[PDB]
C-alpha cells in the first residue's frame, strides 16, 4: 500500500483516457467493477479540496454487489452507472494500493468482448450444464463467453466426459418449452445460438452400429 | 431414459 497521492493526482490517474476510466474498451482487457456509492464517495473526496476531509472513502467494499459472502456470486441485473462503475485494471490496482480492499473479499474482474458492432465488458458470461444423452442428471457446469463458438462447447463436453477420438458426438440445447433444438452449426457463437446460463446442453454420442440415439425421439 | 422422452423441435 503506497503513499496516497494528492487529490488532483488521484483524479487524473483514475479518470484519464489513457490508463483510467475513460480508456476505450478493447477486447481481451480486464476491467473491474467498483460499487457506485464507494466511487462517488472517492469522487467527492478528490474533488473536495481538502486532503484531510472526513469524506475520505475508506477501503473499497463491494459487499452489496454479491449475492452472499460464501460463493461470492455477482448479483443479477446490476446496471453500469447505477450499481457499479467500471475501471480498467491499472486504475483498480492503484485504488486498491491507496485505499485497500475489504479483507477477505475478492475483486470483481471481467473481460471486454468484441461483438459485431461494439465492444462491451462481459459482466455476465454463460454457465452451461453439459450432459451426456444417456444421463441427463450427471452434469458438468462450465463457464463460456458469449463469443465462444458452439464448436468450443462441443470440444469441452467431449473432454469433460472423456469421449474417445473415434467416437462421433453432436450437441442439442433444451429450450424453455422443454423440447430440444439441434445445434447444427459449430461455427456460430453462444450468443448467436441464444444460449443462457443454466441451460442444459446435451452431447449425443452415435451408437457403434452407426445409428444415432436421437433417431428414436419424436420429431 | 429421460432423453428418449424429449421432443425435437423441427427447425424452420
UniProtKB/TrEMBL annotation, chain A:
Localization in the cell: Cytoplasm; Nucleus
Protein's gene: USP11
Residues of the full protein shown: 29 to 245 of 920
Protein's job: Deubiquitinating enzyme that removes conjugated ubiquitin from specific proteins to regulate different cellular processes.
Protein name listed in UniProt: Ubiquitin carboxyl-terminal hydrolase
Residue ranges, annotated region (Disordered): 1-22
Family, per entry: Belongs to the peptidase C19 family.
Occurrences of domain DUSP (ranges): 5-113
